[PDB]
Scaffold this active site. Structure first.
Site, PDB file in Angstrom:
ATOM      1  N   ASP A 145       0.847  -1.184   0.000  1.00 41.51           N
ATOM      2  CA  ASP A 145       0.000   0.000   0.000  1.00 41.51           C
ATOM      3  C   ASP A 145       0.887   1.240   0.000  1.00 41.51           C
ATOM      4  OD1 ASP A 145      -2.465  -1.139  -0.209  1.00 41.51           O
ATOM      5  OD2 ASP A 145      -3.000  -0.947   1.912  1.00 41.51           O
ATOM      6  N   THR A 165      -1.410   7.000  -4.807  1.00 42.35           N
ATOM      7  CA  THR A 165       0.001   6.904  -5.165  1.00 42.35           C
ATOM      8  C   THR A 165       0.258   7.488  -6.549  1.00 42.35           C
ATOM      9  OG1 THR A 165       1.898   5.410  -5.320  1.00 42.35           O
ATOM     10  CG2 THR A 165      -0.203   4.590  -6.137  1.00 42.35           C
TER      11      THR A 165
HETATM   12  N1  LIG Z   1      -6.991  -4.066 -14.420  1.00 44.18           N
HETATM   13  C1  LIG Z   1      -6.322  -3.010 -14.941  1.00 44.18           C
HETATM   14  N2  LIG Z   1      -5.820  -3.053 -16.195  1.00 44.18           N
HETATM   15  C2  LIG Z   1      -5.153  -2.010 -16.725  1.00 44.18           C
HETATM   16  N3  LIG Z   1      -4.930  -0.859 -16.071  1.00 44.18           N
HETATM   17  C3  LIG Z   1      -5.377  -0.679 -14.808  1.00 44.18           C
HETATM   18  C4  LIG Z   1      -6.115  -1.771 -14.156  1.00 44.18           C
HETATM   19  N4  LIG Z   1      -6.441  -1.337 -12.925  1.00 44.18           N
HETATM   20  C5  LIG Z   1      -5.953  -0.075 -12.799  1.00 44.18           C
HETATM   21  N5  LIG Z   1      -5.317   0.312 -13.919  1.00 44.18           N
HETATM   22  C6  LIG Z   1      -4.665   1.626 -14.138  1.00 44.18           C
HETATM   23  O1  LIG Z   1      -3.921   1.997 -12.977  1.00 44.18           O
HETATM   24  C7  LIG Z   1      -4.152   3.365 -12.645  1.00 44.18           C
HETATM   25  C8  LIG Z   1      -4.304   3.478 -11.135  1.00 44.18           C
HETATM   26  O2  LIG Z   1      -3.127   2.938 -10.531  1.00 44.18           O
HETATM   27  P1  LIG Z   1      -3.138   2.362  -9.027  1.00 44.18           P
HETATM   28  O3  LIG Z   1      -3.928   1.077  -8.987  1.00 44.18           O
HETATM   29  O4  LIG Z   1      -1.725   2.366  -8.500  1.00 44.18           O
HETATM   30  O5  LIG Z   1      -3.957   3.474  -8.204  1.00 44.18           O
HETATM   31  P2  LIG Z   1      -5.171   3.022  -7.255  1.00 44.18           P
HETATM   32  O6  LIG Z   1      -4.616   2.070  -6.222  1.00 44.18           O
HETATM   33  O7  LIG Z   1      -6.317   2.587  -8.133  1.00 44.18           O
HETATM   34  O8  LIG Z   1      -5.581   4.416  -6.563  1.00 44.18           O
HETATM   35  P3  LIG Z   1      -4.878   4.966  -5.205  1.00 44.18           P
HETATM   36  O9  LIG Z   1      -3.448   4.717  -5.602  1.00 44.18           O
HETATM   37  O10 LIG Z   1      -5.001   6.387  -4.647  1.00 44.18           O
HETATM   38  O11 LIG Z   1      -5.314   3.949  -4.172  1.00 44.18           O
HETATM   39  C9  LIG Z   1      -5.395   3.813 -13.403  1.00 44.18           C
HETATM   40  O12 LIG Z   1      -5.135   5.032 -14.105  1.00 44.18           O
HETATM   41  C10 LIG Z   1      -5.718   2.700 -14.387  1.00 44.18           C
HETATM   42  O13 LIG Z   1      -5.684   3.182 -15.746  1.00 44.18           O
END
Ligand SMILES: Nc1ncnc2c1ncn2[C@@H]1O[C@H](COP(=O)(O)OP(=O)(O)OP(=O)(O)O)[C@@H](O)[C@H]1O
Ligand SMILES: Nc1ncnc2c1ncn2[C@@H]1O[C@H](COP(=O)(O)OP(=O)(O)OP(=O)(O)O)[C@@H](O)[C@H]1O
Ligand SMILES: Nc1ncnc2c1ncn2[C@@H]1O[C@H](COP(=O)(O)OP(=O)(O)OP(=O)(O)O)[C@@H](O)[C@H]1O
Lengths: 512, 506, 529
Positions: free
Chosen positions: A48, A82
């Site tokens: 996280d 993040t």
């Molecule tokens: N299953 C997936 N396939 C492709 N891209 C994805 C997928 N899930 C998330 N993303 C991409 O990842 C990005 C978000 O990244 P990340 O998961 O690190 O942030 P988060 O955890 O969703 O939000 P936060 O970081 O504040 O908790 C989004 O812009 C999205 O386009």
């Protein structure tokens, strides 16, 4: 100890770049892990991004601003936190136009704030309307957060929990349609059972235990009395204690304590209630009269909890028990229950109304499963909060970051002045969000990002993102990585607000 | 013991670019260079910088060896190579940090190099009219003498104009070797002039002011006591034996100068010193005696008329003598000089005499004159002119970025960086003029967006704006810009192709 | 020698005192002006406060040095005298010390520097007072409308500048009241800026009166009243209590019933005394009873309940009425007739979208008004309210002090030429004291030019090129009162742009900076214990 000149502006660049380089590879569902060493010799391997930078101690005061602003970001949204710090680091990493071109920061700030309204209007152009009434459309939107978890086997139940919780808290009669998870969506845990046994209670649940067995267990027509003052002897304006030395004086203080306590109980039982919920504590002598009338005694509740109980059954909050009226009847409620489920007492005063609040009932075989369902359902209620606030979706996965950065390149041809050189620097700093998604999957970064930009300059900008799982390009209309507009607007507003904050800093001054 | 191993080959060429970036332009700074013979010198020419600065890194020696090829086939833009190709290797380092391979930048540079060779004929505005006039020639030469000697171009543009017009009827034979420079100490540049034929700074030591003899013999030995090629044991005991050698030395030298009169030669050049009694024998038989102590002044005469320098003391050899039409004396600028004029011949030799009080100042004018002849030595070929002052450097950077945007694929990154390396040359001109370089580039792209071509830098410290180059009379050479782009791209692709350097024993 | 410390004298304590004082000027160098940069104030706990205001910078700046401790007290002499100016004293006095430190190395005793500075300061006030402007041109002639338009350019309100500048010009001239012998000043209280959703930002109206953001409730009571009596009260007409923490005891159940019948009967007695005064405008903080509102719709009294306390303090100050805290006059119950009532002309319930407001017109002594900022959403209305408040204080602080001076670099650039020509008229070992006083005043456009992202060698010199022509010949082709527009990077006239500064912030800045530079220059020996 104190620094001045251009070493502070170049020092604040490396202070924010070393924070974004920690969580650079922690983006997407294919995120990598980190190794946190403890002074006691332990190692936590959490992934996280909010938990990594919280335990890291920093010494630079500009690096301290990256954490406390992002700590406020967790209270607003719970997704993409993040991605803000990576965008905060990449916007400040192009130090060629910052100091090497001898540009003033006011030149860069006037170009960064002129890029903000272009980053906002482009994100509102690529949006899509949302049919909020359909539950099958709201099932696929929580799939971006419930995946890679233990609740994926019960995704249909967790979608029904978060949808019914966000719809009861939303009071749309005021026009603004406020949503309050921290006040009206108090989540409680019930030990025992399985994850499928978890449901949503239609009302308020109180975790006050049962002291005396002479209480109401199951009443179909409860009558709740809400109070603020405590049930004891009346004290003066000060907090002085009444000491007794003579034997005759022990009878005088005890008879006025007995008369004042039984008077505050006798005017409650004239309405014949079933449960007494007061704000402050209950004395031991008042509990003897409460168990005599065979009614439930509930104490130690908050003022926010007393507002939701009075709207559930139609009660009214009265400060003193000697001023109760006929309006303080808790009729219309469903049932009263203080049954000990899983070695813990729970007060059930649920009904069939919507008093702008709800209660989530968490079930689990142990405390480890109960701690997993609490943090996973809290992210589910925050996603559906931004949907009912503004039903607009932006396609994530690098599609939104390439739709905006393509518009900034076209708008830079007609933007004359010296500010056009950092205006293109905002467009290249937005490409770091699909850049690390290729680096986290394993494909070639510069080979796939170049063909990604060639797909955006010809075809539609709302399509052709980057799939982080398989590594190749996929259409965003086919797979549900649709992110809310209120999350992407709050990300882009905070990334500019921290880029305008660290660039305005010219001197570091210690002192009080 | 290894950090990057690809960055140190570029940093050695970035130091070579910094020694001529601040020295660019008419507002460029001078360089206090020290000669190898411990002589103080002040100059700002880019070719004299690399001749004295003994650079030792072999990665930066490719651009220096490209400057020696830049001096061939064109005499214009040696500073253009060290600035533009230095900006090529500096901008290529921003691509290698991303993850791009070095072989991808190489093929992307050769694509944009051939594209830049097609846009450059489209920017040709004016051409020479071949009228052989002093008004047409000096209008184009005023830009080439600028960035060498600023402020004194009004006297230099007219003097080289009067020299090159006298050679232009000789079609296909105009070169820099026909225009020689001879420096004479004097008042300043206002007293300078131009003469025909071979002019030497030293006057005739003899009393003959005019002679029409064709036979010219050059003897490098000085006039002194004659030494026999054999042993020749000469011993003296008394004072009468010393006078027999003293009178016998003058009697033998009387037959030595008589052998020059026997072959019909009345012009003699002596490299060394001449005795006073031997100077009297030269004036008796009507022989013109010119003393030339410089070895380059003697080597110039052997390659023009064929008169060789013999080490013997006046040998009567008819085979090794030269031929000239008229050798005489002329009083120009309060100093008598000797003119090797060609009266019967049509004549293709011109000499520009320069006057000045400082030898360190007169040498910078000599590099400004020879760069002025080399501007029109190029214009014996196809006449095409381009606007200068950074006018073509922005329009070439505007079309390549417009070409690289429409071209898809991985090669679009090296094409976009090929255009921004052309932007450093107006950035070099703006920085040396005391102007903020970020404001002039924005002012250049705003006027080139609307189609107002031929716009370059306004050379002024107080005015950060721009002006038109067509009305200002600023014009460069298209062939000077053609070979400069080709040779700097071939030099910058050579440094990027070499990855590591390994020393080897012979 | 055996003493209780270390001793150091000579010119080395002169060079150490000016290097410690000029280092404090670098803390307030970049923060000068409206485009000043923020600076981090690191506390000893670990938290940091991001402040750009120079008055809060010197309050939190703690340098344990006696040369820097001298400049700490002039911030207390600046706010207590006028209230503004603070860091302009610091950059002037530190550059005064740095130029005087060069005089010590040039074989000049500081006694000629101290006596030369006091004559250069008194002649600076003489040249300023000979080139002032009286506080006038309030109506008909603009240097105002254009004066507030420059402050309004930084926000989204600056798209239609001429529409919103008229709302703040007539509001400033409305709140003018002398009240002492012909002073006229402007109060700290100003117009109440409300907001609504009037489908665009162009539907704002200049209401000549206070507007209350309250709803009257019932509709059967008439909304247009003609009477002048306005009643204000703080005690609740609802069911009253003794104290929030102290309660009365109720033992018998029938005793509880008869005090509720008495509460219904004592509400009938209080409404007989309020309506006997003839007061129709009834504003109650604590609320109005439900059966008490039945008596108001038949009598025609305009009763408004749940009114804010701070809104009622401006209402009672408008009609000149007295706020009544309790209705019980210490033995019974009375309404205090002809004491808590004011006078008015007309109160109309104007139909405003999403908040039906209550406007009051022609009160006793209010001089205030209200601006209804009708817009589209809460984003454009909240940013326009702080833009009106920032544009209000610009026109307010100028038109108070009885005469003004065109500032923003126009004062110090004109003083750099006159004090140099005055320095060549005196001599007597004080010519270099006044000539360096003129060059030390040039740091005010020098720090303003480097904060405006312009060339500081060109923008300062363009100020002195125009101010020199005002002294050479009095012809009108010479540009006079040339200010410094930091936005476009080009000098303009302050009379056309309306950039004005008070005289007391300019006079006391030159007075305090020379007295602070005198005290540090008088230090020639250091004693520690
Ligand atoms: N299953 C997936 N396939 C492709 N891209 C994805 C997928 N899930 C998330 N993303 C991409 O990842 C990005 C978000 O990244 P990340 O998961 O690190 O942030 P988060 O955890 O969703 O939000 P936060 O970081 O504040 O908790 C989004 O812009 C999205 O386009
Ligand atoms: N006064 C000027 N106006 C416009 N352009 C100029 C001026 N001076 C120099 N330039 C530009 O500088 C470049 C050539 O300048 P410069 O004279 O320094 O090269 P150079 O010194 O002739 O090269 P070399 O070192 O081989 O002699 C051209 O592109 C020309 O446009
Ligand atoms: N409207 C204006 N146009 C141009 N310059 C201005 C304007 N208003 C103020 N200035 C300049 O800004 C400076 C004020 O700086 P700032 O407000 O940051 O601190 P300060 O008020 O000088 O500090 P302090 O409160 O001690 O006096 C002044 O020197 C003045 O020249």
């Amino acid at each position: 100890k104190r620094e001045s000149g251009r070493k502070v502006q170049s020092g604040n660049i490396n202070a924010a770049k070393t924070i974004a380089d920690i969580i650079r590879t922690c983006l997407g569902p294919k995120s990598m892990m980190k190794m946190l060493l403890d002074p006691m010799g332990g190692i936590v391997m959490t992934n996280d991004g909010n938990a990594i930078l919280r335990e890291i101690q920093v010494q630079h005061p500009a690096a301290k601003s990256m954490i406390e602003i992002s700590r406020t970001q967790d209270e607003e949204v719970g997704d993409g936190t993040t991605s803000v710090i990576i965008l905060a680091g990449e916007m400040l990493s192009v130090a060629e136009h910052f100091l090497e071109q001898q540009m003033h920061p006011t030149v860069v700030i006037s170009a960064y704030r002129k890029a903000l309204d272009d980053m906002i209007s482009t994100l509102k152009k690529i949006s899509i309307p949302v049919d909020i009434s359909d539950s099958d459309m709201m099932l696929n939107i929580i799939n971006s957060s419930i995946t890679t978890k233990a609740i994926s086997r019960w995704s249909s139940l967790a979608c029904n929990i978060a949808l019914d919780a966000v719809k009861m808290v939303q009071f749309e009669e005021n026009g603004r349609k406020e949503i309050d998870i921290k006040k009206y969506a108090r989540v409680e845990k019930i030990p025992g059972g399985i994850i499928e046994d978890s449901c949503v209670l239609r009302g308020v649940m109180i975790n006050k235990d049962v002291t005396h067995p002479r209480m109401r267990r199951y009443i179909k027509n409860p009558r709740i009395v809400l109070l603020d003052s405590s049930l004891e002897y009346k004290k003066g304006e000060s907090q002085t204690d009444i000491e007794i030395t003579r034997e005759e004086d022990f009878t005088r203080i005890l008879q006025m304590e007995e008369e004042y306590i039984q008077q505050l109980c006798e005017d409650i039982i004239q309405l014949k209630p079933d449960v007494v919920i007061t704000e402050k504590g209950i004395s031991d002598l008042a509990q003897h009269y409460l168990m005599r009338a065979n009614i439930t005694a509930i104490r130690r509740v908050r003022k926010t909890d007393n507002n939701r109980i009075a709207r559930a059954c139609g009660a009214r909050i009265v400060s003193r028990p000697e001023e109760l009226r006929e309006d303080d009847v808790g009729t219309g409620a469903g049932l009263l229950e203080i049954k000990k489920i899983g070695d813990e007492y729970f007060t059930f005063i649920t009904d069939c109304k919507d008093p702008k609040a709800c209660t989530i009932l968490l079930r689990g075989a142990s405390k480890e499963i109960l701690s997993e369902v609490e943090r996973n359902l809290q992210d589910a209620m925050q996603v559906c909060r931004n949907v009912l606030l503004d039903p607009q979706l932006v396609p994530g996965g690098g599609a939104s970051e390439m739709a905006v950065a393509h518009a900034l390149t076209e708008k830079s041809k007609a933007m004359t002045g010296v500010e056009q050189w950092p205006y293109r620097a905002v467009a290249q700093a937005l490409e770091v969000i699909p850049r690390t998604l290729i680096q986290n999957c394993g494909a070639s970064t510069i080979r796939l990002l170049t063909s990604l930009r060639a797909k955006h300059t010809q075809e539609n900008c709302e399509t052709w993102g980057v799939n982080g799982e398989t590594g190749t390009l996929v259409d965003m209309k086919e797979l549900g990585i649709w992110e809310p507009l209120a999350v992407k607007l709050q990300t882009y507003k905070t990334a500019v607000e921290t880029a305008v904050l660290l660039l305005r800093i010219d001197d570091i001054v210690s002192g009080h | 013991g290894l950090e990057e191993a690809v960055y140190r080959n570029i940093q050695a060429c970035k130091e070579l670019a910094q020694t001529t970036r601040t020295a660019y332009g008419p507002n460029g700074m001078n360089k206090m260079v020290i000669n190898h013979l411990e002589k103080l010198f002040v100059t700002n020419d880019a070719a004299t910088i690399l001749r004295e600065l003994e650079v030792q890194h072999p990665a930066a020696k490719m651009i220096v060896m490209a400057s020696h090829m830049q001096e061939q086939e064109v005499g214009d833009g040696t500073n253009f190579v060290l600035v533009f190709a230095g900006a090529l290797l500096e901008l290529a380092e921003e691509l290698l940090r991303i993850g791009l391979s070095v072989s991808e930048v190489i093929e992307g540079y050769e694509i944009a190099c051939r594209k830049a060779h097609e846009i450059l004929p489209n920017l040709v505005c004016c051409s020479a009219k071949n009228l052989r006039d002093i008004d047409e020639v000096s209008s184009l030469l005023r830009t080439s003498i600028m960035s060498k000697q600023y402020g004194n171009e009004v006297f230099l543009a007219k003097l080289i104009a009067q020299a090159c017009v006298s050679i232009f009827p000789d079609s296909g034979h105009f070169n820099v070797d026909n225009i020689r420079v001879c420096k004479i100490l004097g008042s300043g540049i206002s007293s300078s002039s131009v003469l025909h034929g071979m002019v030497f700074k030293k006057e005739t030591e003899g009393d003959v002011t005019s002679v029409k003899d064709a036979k010219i013999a050059v003897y490098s030995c000085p006039f002194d006591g004659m030494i026999t090629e054999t042993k020749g044991t000469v011993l003296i005991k008394t004072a009468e034996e010393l006078m027999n050698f003293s009178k016998g030395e003058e009697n033998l030298m009387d037959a030595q100068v008589k052998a020059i009169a026997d072959t019909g030669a009345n012009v003699v050049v002596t490299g060394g010193k001449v005795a006073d009694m031997a100077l009297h024998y030269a004036n008796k038989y009507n022989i013109m005696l010119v003393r030339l102590n410089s070895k380059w002044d003697l080597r110039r005469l052997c390659k023009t008329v064929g008169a060789t320098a013999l080490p013997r003391l006046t040998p009567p050899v008819l085979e090794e003598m030269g031929h000239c039409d008229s050798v005489y004396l002329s009083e120009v600028g309060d100093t008598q000089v000797v003119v090797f004029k060609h009266e019967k011949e049509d004549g293709a030799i011109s000499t520009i005499v320069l006057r000045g009080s400082t030898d360190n100042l007169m040498d910078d004018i000599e590099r400004a004159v020879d760069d002025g002849v080399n501007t029109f030595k190029v214009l014996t070929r196809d006449k095409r002119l381009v606007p200068g002052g950074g006018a073509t450097e922005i329009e070439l950077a505007k079309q390549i970025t417009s070409y690289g945007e429409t071209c898809p694929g991985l090669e679009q990154y090296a094409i976009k960086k090929f255009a921004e390396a052309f932007e450093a040359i107006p950035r070099a001109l703006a920085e040396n003029s005391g102007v903020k370089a970020n404001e002039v580039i924005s002012k250049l792209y705003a006027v080139h967006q609307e189609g107002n071509k031929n716009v370059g830098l306004d050379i002024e410290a107080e005015v950060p704006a721009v002006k038109d180059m067509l009305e200002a009379g600023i014009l460069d050479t298209y062939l000077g810009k053609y070979w400069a782009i080709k040779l700097a791209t071939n030099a910058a692709v050579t440094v990027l192709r070499v990855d590591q350097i390994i020393m080897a024993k012979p | 020698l055996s003493v209780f410390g270390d001793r150091s004298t000579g010119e080395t304590i002169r060079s150490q005192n000016v290097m410690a004082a000029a280092s404090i000027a670098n803390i307030v160098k970049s923060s000068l002006g409206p485009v000043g940069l923020d600076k981090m104030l690191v506390d000893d706990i670990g938290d940091v406060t991001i402040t750009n205001d120079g008055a809060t910078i010197l309050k939190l700046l703690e340098v344990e040095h006696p040369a820097a401790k001298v400049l700490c007290e002039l911030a207390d002499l600046q706010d207590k005298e006028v209230g503004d100016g603070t860091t302009s004293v610091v950059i002037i006095a530190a550059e005064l010390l740095k130029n005087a430190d060069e005089l010590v190395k040039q074989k000049i005793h500081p006694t000629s520097v101290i006596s030369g500075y006091r004559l250069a300061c008194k002649e600076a006030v003489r040249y300023i007072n000979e080139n002032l402007i009286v506080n006038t041109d309030e109506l008909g002639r603009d240097c105002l409308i254009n004066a507030a338009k420059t402050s309004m350019s930084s926000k989204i309100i600056g798209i239609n500048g001429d529409f919103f500048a008229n709302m703040v010009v007539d509001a400033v001239l409305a709140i003018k009241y002398t009240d002492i012998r012909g002073q006229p000043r402007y109060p700290v209280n100003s117009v109440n800026i409300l907001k609504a959703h009037g489908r665009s930002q162009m539907e704002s109206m200049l209401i000549s009166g206070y507007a209350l953001n309250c709803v009257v409730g019932s509709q059967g009571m008439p909304k247009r009243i003609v009477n002048a009596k306005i009643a204000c009260l703080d005690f609740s007409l609802q069911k009253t209590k003794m104290k929030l923490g102290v309660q009365v005891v109720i033992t018998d159940p029938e005793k509880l019933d008869q005090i509720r019948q008495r509460e219904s009967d004592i509400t009938k007695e209080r409404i007989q005394k309020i309506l006997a005064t003839g007061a129709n405008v009834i504003l109650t903080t604590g609320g109005i009873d439900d059966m008490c509102l039945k008596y108001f719709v038949e009598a025609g009294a305009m009763a408004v309940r749940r009114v804010l306390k701070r809104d009622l303090k401006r209402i009672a100050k408008a009609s000149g009425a007295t706020i009544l805290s309790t209705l019980a006059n210490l033995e019974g119950e009375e309404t205090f007739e002809a004491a808590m009532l004011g006078q008015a002309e007309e109160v109309v319930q104007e139909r405003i979208c999403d908040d039906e407001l209550i406007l009051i017109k022609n009160t006793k002594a209010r001089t205030s008004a209200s601006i209804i900022l009708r817009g589209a959403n809460d984003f454009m209305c909240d940013e326009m309210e702080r833009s009106l408040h920032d544009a209000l204080c610009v026109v307010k602080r100028v038109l108070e002090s009885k005469s003004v001076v065109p500032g923003g670099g126009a004062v110090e650039a004109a003083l750099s030429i006159y004090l140099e020509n005055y320095a060549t008229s005196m001599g007597s070992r004080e010519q270099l004291a006044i000539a360096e006083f003129a060059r030390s005043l040039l740091v005010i456009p020098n720090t303003l030019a480097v904060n405006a992202a312009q060339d500081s060698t060109d923008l300062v010199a363009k100020l002195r090129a125009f101010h020199n022509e005002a002294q050479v010949n009095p012809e009108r082709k010479n540009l006079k009162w040339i200010g410094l527009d930091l936005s476009n990077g080009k000098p303009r006239d302050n009379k056309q742009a309306g950039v004005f500064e008070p005289t007391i912030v300019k006079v006391k800045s030159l007075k305090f900076a020379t007295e602070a530079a005198i005290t540090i220059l008088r230090i020639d020996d250091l004693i520690k214990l």
